[PDB]
Symmetry: D2
Subunit: 494 residues, 4 copies
């Protein structure tokens, strides 16, 4: 039930957002953001750098001062504000979904039904938490009354990637604002537009100036400035494992700001011989190909028990061959372009590595159109653990299918990775499902499904897939600083 999109939405916001006002970079520099479907420049965007970050941080610090409107505001009112923002986003849903597709490349039907819905659910969920994250009264030894305050951690730097621009913004703003923090946010140069428009809505909703500040720009500049800033209390970063390390090192080298990381993965999707064949095949397809394969938790290692391997591979290849690649604004399109040229080439490079290393190319394997960054849905069979495409995050429409015999075997192989973001298990058997879900070293284990996200269930990596959790009650922890208050009393009684 999807409203017709404006396939060329107007852009209203393309500057740096500080104190609820729009600003050029101090340097006046700008950078183009491209439509990945055409390769054409959509528009120019203010290129924030250290000096702009510095202004944003000072605005946030000021907004976070004891006695400020934001600090004095009732927690429940923070909730009202988050709900207002959600309402405004819903009002402009059709526009935002189109803009998202324009700048990112994902099919408009998905932007509208999936990304925007999830954004709304996330904000509305966290709205509910604003006045419900209690501290404790504690029965300490001796004649004392002891309790904890759950205070905001303070000025939060938030750095988000380009694969889910609006959704990532929501996953960050929701918990941070619900718990009374202020933020300086760096959005991805590939996809700055939708986030900037939301800032307009943040203003419209009534958030005090300085509470949310957005700085578009490049990573080694604006991003590094946030990570290294002496007055940023906490940084949250979603992106590559490689940059994640830069972030944590920067935090250690600067002011020991608190850090959470949502990084990449090479998530194993395990199909047992008793799985429902049709369901497993469609889910495995979805698990890998969703969002042009641009998911950190993509099912990029499809383990299939030998007894069903041949059939599973056949059906998978057929499903991949029938997948509709094309104009993201066309309702029939299942798969849009990759986000940019760098990704485009990286993916082609990996495909080549797959060919080179002896994986069986079963379909696709090349460019899918001659404008934009479209790539054919690609499937490799007989993939081995030692192969590059079996170890490294491809982040494109490239599926790896591996064969295994025993449950003990697949556990060891699935877990033999420095990633651990997610995993899935397809089986009808109670015991197998429980054995596997316990044994897999991943932040999320899905059973007979994949990519099931709920605002109420935490998500995050084991190992080098990250640290900390987002969503659910757990998502509040990293945005809270704990204070113990311990008072002498005349005589302690139970």
């Amino acid at each position: 039930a999807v409203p017709a999109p404006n396939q060329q939405p107007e852009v209203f916001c393309n500057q740096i957002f500080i104190n609820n006002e729009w600003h050029d970079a101090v340097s006046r520099k700008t950078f183009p953001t491209v439509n990945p479907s055409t390769g054409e420049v959509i528009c120019q965007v203010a290129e924030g750098d250290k000096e702009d970050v510095d202004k944003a941080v000072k605005a946030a610090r000021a907004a976070f001062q004891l006695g400020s409107p934001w600090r004095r505001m009732d927690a429940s009112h923070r909730g009202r504000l988050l709900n207002r923002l959600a309402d405004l986003i819903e009002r402009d849903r059709t526009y935002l979904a189109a803009l998202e597709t324009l700048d990112n490349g994902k099919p408009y039907v998905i932007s509208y039904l999936v990304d925007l819905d999830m954004v709304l659910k996330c904000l509305r969920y966290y709205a509910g938490w604003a006045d419900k994250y209690h501290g404790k009264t504690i029965p300490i030894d001796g004649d004392f009354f002891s309790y904890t305050r759950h205070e905001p951690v303070g000025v939060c730097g938030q750095i988000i990637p380009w694969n889910f621009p609006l959704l990532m913004q929501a996953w960050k703003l929701g918990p941070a604002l619900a718990t009374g923090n202020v933020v300086v946010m760096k959005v991805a140069e590939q996809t700055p537009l939708t986030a900037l428009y939301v800032a307009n809505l943040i203003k419209e909703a009534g958030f005090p100036p300085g509470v949310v500040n957005i700085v578009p720009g490049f990573g080694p500049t604006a991003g590094a400035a946030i990570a290294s800033h002496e007055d940023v209390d906490k940084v949250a970063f979603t992106g590559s494992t490689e940059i994640g390390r830069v972030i944590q090192v920067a935090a250690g080298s600067s002011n020991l700001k608190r850090v959470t990381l949502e990084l990449g993965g090479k998530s194993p999707n395990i199909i047992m011989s008793d799985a429902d064949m049709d369901w497993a095949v469609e889910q495995a397809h979805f698990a890998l190909f969703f969002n042009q394969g641009q998911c950190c938790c993509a099912g990029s290692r499809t383990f299939v028990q030998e007894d069903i391997y041949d059939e599973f591979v056949e059906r998978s290849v057929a499903r991949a061959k029938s997948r509709v690649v094309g104009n993201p604004f066309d309702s029939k399109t299942e798969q849009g372009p990759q986000v940019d040229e760098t990704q485009f080439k990286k993916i082609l490079g990996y495909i080549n590595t797959g060919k080179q290393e002896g994986a069986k190319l079963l379909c696709g394997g090349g460019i899918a159109a001659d404008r934009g960054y479209f790539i054919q849905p690609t499937v490799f069979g007989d993939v081995q653990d030692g192969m590059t495409i079996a170890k490294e995050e491809i982040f494109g429409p490239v599926m790896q299918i591996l064969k295994f015999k025993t449950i003990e075997e697949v556990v060891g192989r699935a877990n033999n990775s420095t990633y651990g973001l997610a995993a899935a298990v397809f089986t009808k058997d109670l015991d197998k499902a429980n054995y596997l879900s316990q044994a897999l070293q991943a932040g999320t284990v899905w059973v007979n499904c994949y990519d099931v996200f709920g605002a109420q269930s935490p998500f995050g990596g084991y190992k080098m897939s990250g640290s900390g959790r987002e969503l659910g009650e757990y998502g509040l922890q990293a945005y809270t600083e704990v204070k113990t208050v311990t008072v002498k009393v005349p005589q302690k009684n139970s």
Copy 2:
């Protein structure tokens, strides 16, 4: 009610502890540990380095393998084991208190009545948590059953300082073991002995081999090896802010292991004009001078409202002058030696800086004996915020007294620091107490008391005094890795 101490306890453990066995360093090197009261070498200790740490980590990894005794053991049995350890420590309480005093220098009466009691309470507290830290069942959207497992984070490197050897070991082992982790622990070269003996008790209690491993040695070697290790999942460090940064950088540079830090402070102790004079004076004395001034949360900035300043200073100086410095085994001794020569000199250097910068030396200010590292209880009056001794952690028997007028003023001054470990407020007024406890940026705010610790109340730093919390339920968080399991079900019902 204190048993007479053996003033020369025999040493039974001085090697590296791995798989419940004692080992020499691979290099066979050893290092002397000194009795700070005499300057004499107590004994030689195995000097662990990278290769030793590597063996310890492998032992831990093995003990943490799925299906291992430690992994399969009932959570409640982990609790039994912690209680057994506490029992064994209590059995050997008199010995351990003596050994603690011998190697550290703190008065034996305090070791016995304070340190060991606190050790016992910590372990017994955490024993109770072992089977009570629940995950969640979560009402996620759609036809799914979603829940979280609270799993052990895994192999935990733990690095502890010398000021509270036994207590720090307990604050680390308790939460870690209660939640089913394994540890590789680096103890301080100044104070290795008591921790090594406890390892014997850990074996005696029945903990599986590899669950707890201890590596004595130096920081830039053994410590750095742990922080940088590729198979250590989590590191907890207590020590200086300076080294804290090294730790977090090492974590970012290696495997993105999770990090918690308990660092230094320059905690403000605020005396309002309506405070109970006698109580405030005694508590302020205690707040600073306790444990030879070797507390991260020492009340090293004593702010006194002008109307009571003169009297407060007078009484403080008197109390300081009457403080008994001497042999830690003598029941009359209130203050032993500083831990070692480096600290000895650092403190003298700070005292000199205080004189140099124009603070009023009101008493002490020099060496207190000609053997060992004894320092006169020292008090500076009319201290100004810009002074070095008002900004930097001295970690010795050196009190700073500052004068202020208004509550608004003292809040801003107290908070004007990059530390934020603790603070205290002395007042009879309800409103003043609440205003201050809310406004002070510190991990713990004490009201009309100081240095009140309870195993049930969390403790840790704001700002550069650290990150994360120890003690209480909060102490379990950093030792837990959260897994979401999300299962497709036929039809979800409330």
Copy 3:
């Protein structure tokens, strides 16, 4: 900032509400509801009895069937629905506040600014809980996976009084609906109208039929039918202690349905000699006189320390004398009529008892107008604990002022009661505040304030003032039935 009221709002709903439809009583009987300001009949209302209750219960049971729209609905959607209801109530705020005043008698300014705001905050608060009340995953001994589901308790009978018609409905509906229960609600015969209109909004908001059912009528009929019903799972009752006992007896005599009770009180308001005189006097006045004295937690025993007694009494009498009694629709009116003739006479009876027993009548003491049920603000001084007006809930504009000397004395006197709903302490002293708040046996202790309610803080009685709590997270407990699920697994691991 209050919109002008329609002083004769039209009535749209006066029937029994079942399955989102309006019905006459099976008997076709009706009863008048009166405007307490004039004594005139506002309108006729369906008089529900056992047979009507029976229909309502069956509708609720049906709506609660496994697989029903209400049972299958996402928890988060329950939240959306509660927020919609809140929105609809806000839309019709001016109307509802006027209708509330018309039927109940409270000043329209209060209905609008207080009752309706509180209604909105309650519903919006609970909307937030709907998908956040987790069960647990539990580390049980042995090779099992054990967890709990927090299920709805089921069909909930809810019986509410007349003193805060809209608010009481909110306090009941919020937690019940947030946790996915269904309700059969009995509203007070004195004040049925506003609750019935809200039922219309419940329908409009989109709640499935049968989820909320309302049955107007009398207590010994409709109420008793709910309490004794064989298919009602849980009953919540707010009202007199006397009827509370009937309710619990009925539950025990029928099907052992779960019970919570919010009953009366005789709450002590304790003014220490160091209190802020002006603040304490105004708050004490408010504490007693609010809502025509018709609050279960009214501060009906004002304990004043002897040193300030005379002045406090003087100021209190003056404040009471200046209190404006009259037409609730007039913006200048502070106090409307009592709810009905029965209460009117009960109160006059108590005033007479006060005179008879030797309390000092300091002002008021009689009827305040010759139409409606208006009573003069009345103050008794030198009240003694043994006096009837010091022991029994008057529920009218009748203040008792008692004198005391010591803190130990006042504690014992305040606690010497079979009520324990609330209490208050006025003092500037930290220690006194802490001593008293710990020692007073009451569900809520206010310090330097009174009647401070927040949707996030629980409220309920000690002793015979009730059992269970409303508001906050605690309010969810009585609406939840806990199921343990314990599953054999192949091998349990931490």
Copy 4:
């Protein structure tokens, strides 16, 4: 690994236990307790009545006075005391197990390995909770600091049955003492001895006098006195649904004391066609026959899918026939006598009713020896839902086997009962397991197991099987009274 029992343990305690002293009944009356294996009187026991209960309540009230040793004691010390008690019980384990068997009739091997182990785990579990049940600090609207104290509910009347004498005492004392309450306990006239000995241990462990008081006697006297007492704050009763109602009525008729109930059941044990036959058969046997069939949660309705019915019945009959009935002190004995003559006759009466109503008697059906109260393991086949033995709790060695076809069918039949204590599901299928566990209306649903209890997992009834939960964190709720404290502050900040 079981120590040889003293088959005639000496009795040391047979009086009323008040203030850690032993007393005769005021009336000096005594009653015989019988050995159900022989029918011989073991010894005489003080017969407590109202006057004795009154003394016990006063002692408890006194021990619960503000400032008393028990009220002032550190929460953690409560835990130490519970652990000491557990230790003492373990010390006297062999003795207690024998005495339990002597008075109750259950096999000594079971008393020793099961009952006593469970007792120890329960107490040790709750010891850990003593200082961990936090209240909350709450982010309330306005300039206030609001928090809750979790206080003890107070004087707790606890009434326990005879089927698990020691275990029931533990399930009651653990949560109550851990949370700082005091108790007056009524133990069953059939089995008073072990609970009285434990009182001796309670004294030995160091519990202040009056904290635990035990009154042996009859139900309509001592029990009723507790339920109706004006100074008992809370009552917990385990027993028959019929008496449960008397208890709740008594609570409503007296002082509105808080009530929790653990009542009977007719729990369905559902065997699907894909279940592991051998496992299901042995578990179904255990589910029903354990403890002479005297478990409230006995699997007394065994539903078997038609395709496996014949085989399942055959194997069940064989297993029942081979069950060893005899002297509970003989290591070969699987089943002892029933608890007394009343039960003996009730069970025979039910067996006759089964024959009479047309159930197929497949084995047993009569008396098993001519001394004591031994009954043949009895199995009825082709049982129909309308039969009396299918509806009423038999509480003896009498198995009902019913046949069903579809999963929808069995859900409706299993749930068609006014009981709802427990249920079980045997199946290998993931979906079936999840569907059934969600749909069954029972406090505990076991999957592929039965009678799996853990101190950490809650247990209790839906419907008329009771209200409230015992064990786990949930077991603490009914022993806690919640107080909100709400303090005016100068300026509220997040």
